[PDB]
């Protein structure tokens, strides 16, 4: 019920017909949505004469009092949502010229007065929806030059008339909305008795190639830049369908979800420039070479779901003639997601110059392997980003990326990739920084792995089931510029010292869900394995759920920059003391669901210095004061964040405080 006293008055879901009268004056915004009220009391609003905003939603009010807005003219934005009123007079609006925005939502005004808005000319935006009209006469005279947006959505306006739109000849509407309005006919020249129309949007309106061809002629000599149309039932296109648009200069276009099938040649020769263009969700069976001739200035294109769904029973095979992209000399961004092209030809992309981003995820029904020249068509483009996931590839032949030198980000994960990595597949790669290869079947490793590309910076390998991983010569040896590396979930068993050496800028490591418990066991033949060396830049480390039960004290000696580390879900019970000494700045820790029993300050000497958060929500504690003394006392005296401190930090192990919060002790 209460209002946040922050120059606003929010009163929602309070369902009261009497406005509060205890409201301090100095607040200046109000809302009464989700409430029911009878009529506007001006007297109650008179005490507090500061309101830049007023909102009423889900409130049915039959009439408004004209005297309230003359009382309070510093009101600038007003909301009327879900109101019973459907016929209002300018009397209420007689002195309301100072508003700048008025919301008419779900108010079902079937008809308005003759000249209800002659008074006001300063407002910028006015929206109307859920309102049924068939005439758009709002004022006999030219007025309201200061309005930029008008919405007529959810309306039953049928025919537009030239005499109707003369009202804003003195004005220049930035954009008009006419969607969700069943409109059947347009009077000729209606769009001209008005100022410059910059943007027009038309969606879910049934036109067809013929009627569009008629209206296309109606659009000659206009300052239109943004045309939007979707779900317009345009199965095919002709050249004359876009003929009358030759007398204007469009900038943006959209043809999504129109279920288009076939485009004739040179249907787009009228547009030298189209920087952005969207074509998605269409049933296209064949593309012609000269269909897309004339589009020189293009920067962004998409074809997601914009082709025929492949059916061998139909044997449609949506095919693309090569050199069809020789007309696109400026394209920089392309989107070929999730289509069913049969395979990669040899000269799809001959001519492309400016390409920098390209996506081919789930784009081919069958791309089993990579060949010597499968990308020969991409010789003359400085691509930066490539996307080739969910493509059920099977194997890679070497010397396939010879053309690509400028690439810096590569994504090949989530496919069916099993082979041995010879290292010769990285021939042409020169500027690569990151490569994703997680979610594959298996790979066999060699020392001849990454000699060609020491310029890499990040490499993700998760759930890949690597082979030949414990080789004494580190296959990562040629790489030295690595920053973050991940090897989680691989359940690897044996590890050599030599993989972690010569690397200095490694920021974060992740090895969770693996089986490396034996290598740090005290009784291990050869003793504990100390692979942690040469790392002066590690800040975050993750070793969750690896079955650990013992930590040698000499592993964190090289770790001076570690900030966050996790060891939860392991099998740890008790740790040796004086092991966090080299850890100058640790900010967080996690040991929940371990078998830690006692808290002793000797092990937590450097640990409890200065932390931000620690979590051990479930552990078999012995809540007795021999060990819990510090921890109970430290909690009551410490500022470090400990979530669910009382919710999930009880003790059931000892009869003492059996099943009771340790903090209470």
């Amino acid at each position, epitope marked *: 019920k209460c209002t946040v006293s922050h120059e606003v008055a929010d009163c929602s879901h309070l369902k009261l017909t009497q406005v509060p009268d205890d409201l301090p004056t100095n607040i200046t915004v109000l809302n009464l949505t989700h409430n029911q009220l009878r009529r506007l009391p001006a007297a109650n609003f008179t005490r507090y004469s500061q309101l830049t905003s007023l909102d009423v939603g889900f409130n049915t009010i039959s009439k408004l009092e004209p005297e309230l807005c003359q009382k309070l003219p510093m009101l600038k934005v007003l909301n009327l949502q879900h109101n019973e009123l459907s016929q209002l007079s300018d009397k209420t609006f007689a002195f309301c010229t100072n508003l700048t925005e008025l919301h008419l939502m779900s108010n079902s005004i079937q008809k308005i007065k003759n000249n209800p808005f002659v008074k006001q000319k300063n407002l910028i935006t006015l929206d109307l929806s859920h309102n049924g009209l068939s005439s758009t006469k709002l004022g006999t005279q030219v007025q309201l030059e200061n309005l930029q947006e008008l919405l007529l959505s959810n309306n039953k306006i049928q025919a537009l008339k030239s005499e109707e739109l003369d009202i804003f000849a003195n004005s220049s509407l930035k954009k008009l909305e006419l969607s969700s309005n069943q409109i059947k006919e347009f009077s000729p020249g209606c769009f001209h008795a008005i100022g410059r129309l910059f943007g027009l949007f038309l969606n879910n309106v049934q036109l067809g190639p013929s009627l569009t061809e008629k209206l296309c002629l109606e659009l000659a000599n206009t300052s239109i830049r943004n045309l939007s149309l979707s779900n317009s039932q345009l199965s095919t296109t002709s050249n004359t369908t876009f003929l009358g648009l030759k007398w204007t200069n469009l900038t943006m276009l959209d043809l999504s979800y129109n279920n288009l099938n076939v485009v004739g040649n040179d249907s787009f020769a009228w547009l030298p420039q189209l920087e952005y263009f969207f074509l998605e969700y269409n049933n296209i069976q064949h593309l012609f070479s000269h269909s897309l001739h004339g589009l020189f200035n293009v920067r962004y294109l998409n074809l997601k779901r914009s082709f025929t769904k492949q059916s061998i029973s139909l044997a449609s095979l949506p095919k693309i003639d090569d050199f069809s992209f020789q007309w696109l000399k400026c394209l920089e961004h392309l989107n070929m997601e999730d289509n069913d092209i049969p395979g990669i030809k040899s000269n799809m992309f001959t001519g492309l110059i400016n390409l920098k981003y390209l996506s081919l995820s789930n784009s081919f029904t069958s791309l089993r392997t990579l060949t010597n020249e499968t990308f020969v068509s991409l010789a003359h483009s400085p691509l930066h980003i490539l996307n080739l996931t969910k493509n059920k590839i099977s194997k890679i032949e070497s010397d396939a990326f010879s053309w690509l030198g400028h690439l810096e980000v590569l994504d090949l994960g*989530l496919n069916e990739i099993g082979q041995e990595l010879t290292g010769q597949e990285w021939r042409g790669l020169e500027n690569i920084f990151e490569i994703y290869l997680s979610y594959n079947k298996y790979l066999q490793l060699t020392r001849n792995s990454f000699a060609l590309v020491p310029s890499l910076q990040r490499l993700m390998l998760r759930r890949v089931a690597l082979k030949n991983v414990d080789s004494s010569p580190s296959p990562f040896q040629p790489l030295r510029n690595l920053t973050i590396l991940d090897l989680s*979930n691989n*359940n690897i068993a044996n590890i050599n010292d030599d993989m972690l050496e010569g690397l200095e800028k490694l920021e974060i490591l992740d090895l969770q*869900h693996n089986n490396l418990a034996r290598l740090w066991k005290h009784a291990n033949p050869g003793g504990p394995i100390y692979f942690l060396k040469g790392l002066s830049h590690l800040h975050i480390l993750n070793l969750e759920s690896n*079955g650990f039960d013992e930590i040698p004290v000499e592993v964190f000696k090289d770790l001076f920059e570690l900030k966050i580390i996790d060891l939860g879900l*392991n099998n740890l019970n008790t740790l040796p003391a004086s092991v966090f000494n080299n850890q100058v700045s640790l900010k967080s820790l996690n040991l929940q669901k371990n078998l830690i029993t006692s808290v002793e300050k000797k092990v937590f000497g450097p640990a409890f210095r200065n932390l931000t958060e620690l979590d051990m929500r479930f552990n078999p504690f012995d809540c007795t004061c021999e060990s819990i003394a510090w921890f109970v006392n430290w909690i009551n005296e410490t500022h470090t964040n400990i979530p669910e401190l009382s919710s999930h930090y009880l003790c059931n192990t000892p009869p003492h405080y059996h099943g009771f919060p340790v903090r209470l002790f």
Partner: antibody
Amino acid sequence: EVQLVQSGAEVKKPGESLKISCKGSGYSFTNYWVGWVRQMPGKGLEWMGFIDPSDSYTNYADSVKGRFTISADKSISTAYLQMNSLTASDTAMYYCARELYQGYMDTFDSWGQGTLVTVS
Amino acid sequence: GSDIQMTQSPSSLSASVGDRVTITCRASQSIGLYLAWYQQKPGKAPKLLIYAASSLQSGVPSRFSGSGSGTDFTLTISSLQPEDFATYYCQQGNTLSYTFGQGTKVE
């Protein structure tokens, strides 16, 4: 066409080794991994590990840690599972399966007929 | 300890022929569309791969419906049949651990 045959049922003394042969036919057998699953009497089913016939490359579960060895011979196209030191509570049922990697998630398409071993 | 804990809630038994059954799923850690289903005949080892992934069907079986994502999942059979009376099992693949679930619904 795909088939798997295991060794016969068996009962013996605690403190022994034993070998089980898992043979299959209907495919190359040189390309797909083979793993072993154990089900205790009236219990759930649990994984131990798998081996690649191409090079006899192996991975064991956390519960194995020795005491069980997986092997195969290319010429016979048969898989061998042996427990080295056998004791009480090891009585259960045993099966062998072949991975298919249907879609992007590994799937065990075919399962062996079944082998029962009780230590009494 | 180091498993993705897997639990089957309904524990349903003795449904009449033609009924609709629902098998739900709960996991310690979120698995993304990495759930699989296995069915066991009471007198035989399973040999029954009904769901490769969530909402996936093998070549042989039919009329089984599965759904769910993230931590929870649902398994449904449109209408029970006289052959449709057997125990079920579920396994996780997010990690190579390949851990299965405890005994599922028995019909």
